[PDB]
Amino acid sequence: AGNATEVPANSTVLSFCAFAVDAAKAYKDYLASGGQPITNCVKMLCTHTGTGQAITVTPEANMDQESFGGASCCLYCRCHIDHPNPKGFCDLKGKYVQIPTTCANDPVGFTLKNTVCTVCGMWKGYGCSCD
Amino acid sequence: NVTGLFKDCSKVITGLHPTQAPTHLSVDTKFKTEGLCVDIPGIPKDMTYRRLISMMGFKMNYQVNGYPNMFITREEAIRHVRAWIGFDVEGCHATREAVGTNLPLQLGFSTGVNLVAVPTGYVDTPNNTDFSRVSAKPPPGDQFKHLIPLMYKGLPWNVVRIKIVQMLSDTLKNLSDRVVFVLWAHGFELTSMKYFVKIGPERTCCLCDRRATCFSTASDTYACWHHSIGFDYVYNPFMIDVQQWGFTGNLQSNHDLYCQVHGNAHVASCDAIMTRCLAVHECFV
Numbered sequence: 185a186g187n188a189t190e191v192p193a194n195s196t197v198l199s200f201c202a203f204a205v206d207a208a209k210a211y212k213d214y215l216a217s218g219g220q221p222i223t224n225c226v227k228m229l230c231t232h233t234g235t236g237q238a239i240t241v242t243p244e245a246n247m248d249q250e251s252f253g254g255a256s257c258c259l260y261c262r263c264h265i266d267h268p269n270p271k272g273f274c275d276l277k278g279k280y281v282q283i284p285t286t287c288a289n290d291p292v293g294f295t296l297k298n299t300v301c302t303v304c305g306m307w308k309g310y311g312c313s314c315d
Numbered sequence: 316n317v318t319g320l321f322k323d324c325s326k327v328i329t330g331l332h333p334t335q336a337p338t339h340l341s342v343d344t345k346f347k348t349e350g351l352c353v354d355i356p357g358i359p360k361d362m363t364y365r366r367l368i369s370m371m372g373f374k375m376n377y378q379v380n381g382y383p384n385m386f387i388t389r390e391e392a393i394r395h396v397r398a399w400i401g402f403d404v405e406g407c408h409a410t411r412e413a414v415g416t417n418l419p420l421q422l423g424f425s426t427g428v429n430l431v432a433v434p435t436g437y438v439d440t441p442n443n444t445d446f447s448r449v450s451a452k453p454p455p456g457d458q459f460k461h462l463i464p465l466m467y468k469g470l471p472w473n474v475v476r477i478k479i480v481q482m483l484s485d486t487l488k489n490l491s492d493r494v495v496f497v498l499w500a501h502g503f504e505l506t507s508m509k510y511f512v513k514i515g516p517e518r519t520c521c522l523c524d525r526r527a528t529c530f531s532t533a534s535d536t537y538a539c540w541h542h543s544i545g546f547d548y549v550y551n552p553f554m555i556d557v558q559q560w561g562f563t564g565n566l567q568s569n570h571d572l573y574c575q576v577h578g579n580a581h582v583a584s585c586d587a588i589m590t591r592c593l594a595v596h597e598c599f600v
């Protein structure tokens with residue numbers, strides 16, 4: 185009974201981050217020790233003529249990005265653990281995340297390490313035009 | 316090829332919306348095309364769902380520098396025999412709003428302690444994962460008729476994990492700088508550990524130089540077995556699965572080959588006692 189949500193390639197990393205006191209540090213340390221990035225993310229088929237904003241209500245990938253379902257790019261959603269913000273709610277689940285094509289191999293790691301510019305809505309270092 | 320780890324145990328006849336599904340596998344079929352998913356404006360997100368996620372299938376085979384391994388070799392467990400605590404859990408089945416996973420009910424230890432927990436699960440919602448009480452039924456059978464009254468005599472997990480830390484601290488402070496849980500078919504016990512164990516790099520006690528065996532969420536602090544008062548988590552525990560030592564049959568039949576003083580009362584603590592007993596007889600004779 186029930187419906188499988190995961191693949192065996194993610195068992196080790198999800199189990200490791202599911203038990204950690206600091207899941208974010210655990211995942212970065214897992215990658216640093218040669219571990220593979222979390223796979224089975226929700227990658228979107230899109231026109232690639234989108235605005236290029238980081239977190240959107242519809243896929244907004246441009247020619248330099250890949251669009252993904254937001255919950256699938258969130259380590260806390262992927263591990264079914266508490267979210268680090270004081271309210272305990274997610275900012276990626278329910279939205280689409282645009283990830284640079286060069287970082288599309290590790291969408292979970294990208295969202296953990298990067299910040300969205302509050303002024304232009306693009307990722308800092310990956311499309312943020314202002315200083 | 317799929318795993319049972321994080322299996323969705325809800326009875327919802329549809330998958331999830333692309334923005335809410337944790338994985339490609341969990342996205343509803345309407346959105347799938349050519350190995351990918353599509354956004355369909357007009358088919359909205361669900362804002363009321365409650366989906367029980369299964370904690371059966373953890374695999375602790377990580378190789379990360381600075382992080383100790385939970386499962387140790389037989390030779391390392393022998394060296395730390397003073398840290399041995401037999402551990403067994405009798406679980407109940409998810410029912411009504413969910414089906415397909417087991418939840419901890421009676422946690423038994425070789426110290427003779429039994430703790431009853433309120434059947435609690437990890438329930439995905441549009442916003443987060445909600446650790447909360449779920450509808451559960453005791454296993455279908457007559458050897459599990461002792462579990463029926465326990466479905467109402469359970470404690471919330473915030474109290475249960477405090478009592479486990481308290482019992483381990485009282486037992487092990489004068490014996491060891493660690494805990495080694497001695498298991499038989501570790502699967503459900505490892506699942507149960509998600510409810511009271513945390514892992515990370517080796518730490519020291521806040522009040523002394525001894526290694527940290529406990530962790531407190533409330534204060535974000537670490538403690539040894541001597542200073543763990545009020546602590547809620549077991550930190551960096553060790554363990555071993557006695558079943559994997561080449562045994563042919565079940566726990567009781569292998570235990571009874573060497574020992575005749577531990578009868579089966581059919582309770583979780585009894586299996587935990589028999590596990591540690593068998594481990595001692597096998598390792599030291």
Ligand SMILES: CNC(=O)c1ccccc1
Nearest residue numbers: 187323328329330340341
């Ligand atoms: C009908 N249910 C599904 O399609 C599903 C598939 C995988 C995970 C969760 C739900």
Ligand SMILES: [Mg+2]
Nearest residue numbers: 403404583586
């Ligand atoms: Mg048992």
Ligand SMILES: [Zn+2]
Nearest residue numbers: 258260261274
């Ligand atoms: Zn999330």
Ligand SMILES: [Zn+2]
Nearest residue numbers: 301304312314
């Ligand atoms: Zn900007």
Ligand SMILES: [Zn+2]
Nearest residue numbers: 520523539542
């Ligand atoms: Zn101390």
Ligand SMILES: [Zn+2]
Nearest residue numbers: 574577589592
């Ligand atoms: Zn015995």
